Amino acid sequence: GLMQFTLPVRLCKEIELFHFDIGPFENMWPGIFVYMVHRSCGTSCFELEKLCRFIMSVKKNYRRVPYHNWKHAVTVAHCMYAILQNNHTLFTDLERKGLLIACLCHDLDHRGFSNSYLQKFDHPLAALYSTSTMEQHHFSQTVSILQLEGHNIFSTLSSSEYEQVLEIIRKAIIATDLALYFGNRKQLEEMYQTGSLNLNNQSHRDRVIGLMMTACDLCSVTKLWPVTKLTANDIYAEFWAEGDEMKKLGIQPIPMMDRDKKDEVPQGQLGFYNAVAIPCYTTLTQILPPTEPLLKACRDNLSQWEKVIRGEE
Numbered sequence: 078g079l080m081q082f083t084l085p086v087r088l089c090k091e092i093e094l095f096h097f098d099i100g101p102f103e104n105m106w107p108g109i110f111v112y113m114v115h116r117s118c119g120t121s122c123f124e125l126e127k128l129c130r131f132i133m134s135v136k137k138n139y140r141r142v143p144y145h146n147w148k149h150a151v152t153v154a155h156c157m158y159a160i161l162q163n164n165h166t167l168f169t170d171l172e173r174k175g176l177l178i179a180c181l182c183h184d185l186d187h188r189g190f191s192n193s194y195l196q197k198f199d200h201p202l203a204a205l206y207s208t209s210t211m212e213q214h215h216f217s218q219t220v221s222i223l224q225l226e227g228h229n230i231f232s233t234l235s236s237s238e239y240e241q242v243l244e245i246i247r248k249a250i251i252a253t254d255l256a257l258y259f260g261n262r263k264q265l266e267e268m269y270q271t272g273s274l275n276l277n278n279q280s281h282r283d284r285v286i287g288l289m290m291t292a293c294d295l296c297s298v299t300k301l302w303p304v305t306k307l308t309a310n311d312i313y314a315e316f317w318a319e320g321d322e323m324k325k326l327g328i329q330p331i332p333m334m335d336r337d338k339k340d341e342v343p344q345g346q347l348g349f350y351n352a353v354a355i356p357c358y359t360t361l362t363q364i365l366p367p368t369e370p371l372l373k374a375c376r377d378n379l380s381q382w383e384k385v386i387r388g389e390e
């Protein structure tokens with residue numbers, strides 16, 4: 078009960094910032110995550126022995142893929158920690174608990190392929206889940222690990238709190254399906270602007286939690302330029318592998334996923350920042366003003382990609 082986690086001074090300070098990079102030392106990531114739970118949630122939320130066993134089973138069920146890996150899980154959990162810490166009183170005990178676990182679990186057992194490639198391949202997961210295929214699988218994997226013996230970190234909750242937290246986590250994980258982002262942000266935009274947004278309306282809270290999940294999941298675009306640029310290589314390493322597997326099925330991949338069209342990467346980043354990232358953080362900042370630093374950093378990185386095309390780097 079009296080066992081705190083402490084980070085070194087640089088990490089203790091930089092971890093509160095949105096643009097924090099968790100570093101190349103895999104063995105520190107579990108401790109970084111426990112640190113964030115204790116400060117975000119309390120040292121009482123979870124039984125440390127159960128939490129540590131949950132975390133190491135989650136780590137084990139992420140694959141060695143270039144991007145959709147254990148490092149991404151923890152990066153996304155840190156972005157959610159930063160949002161929750163900058164919006165202290167807006168979220169319930171249950172929500173703070175649920176959302177950090179949802180982030181850690183959001184991409185469990187990812188293979189580095191889009192929902193589209195699973196459909197074109199005719200993967201068994203595509204027969205069992207027709208939409209948000211991987212996302213329904215990630216939530217399924219989460220429930221499996223929670224049911225391993227000694228792994229039920231939620232065991233002190235009541236029957237009803239337990240169903241609530243697993244509903245928060247299910248919705249949170251489904252919302253990381255980017256195909257659902259576009260309609261969700263558009264509805265939030267309308268509700269903010271026509272002034273009907275209501276945080277006490279649970280259908281509204283769900284949408285706002287969904288946008289936070291998209292914001293955390295894309296948070297590679299909100300880092301300092303050198304982190305953003307190097308993470309983009311891992312992202313495109315998966316896109317090009319999927320493109321290779323599309324060509325093997327007898328289908329030209331879209332140019333973003335074709336490794337013969339690397340030249341077109343900078344313009345593909347522009348489209349993605351304008352079409353997805355900037356609108357995501359704009360709406361998020363309108364609803365939760367203390368998340369403005371994510372919008373500022375995203376803008377800085379858009380400007381950095383424009384410089385890449387003007388040959389300035």
Ligand SMILES: O=c1[nH]c2ccccc2c2nccn12
Pocket residue numbers: 294295296297298312345346349
């Ligand atoms: O160019 C990019 N950059 C990204 C950066 C972070 C997360 C998703 C993406 C992405 N999805 C499609 C294209 N994309």
Ligand SMILES: [Mg+2]
Pocket residue numbers: 183184211253254
């Ligand atoms: Mg995902």
Ligand SMILES: [Zn+2]
Pocket residue numbers: 149153183184253294
């Ligand atoms: Zn993700």
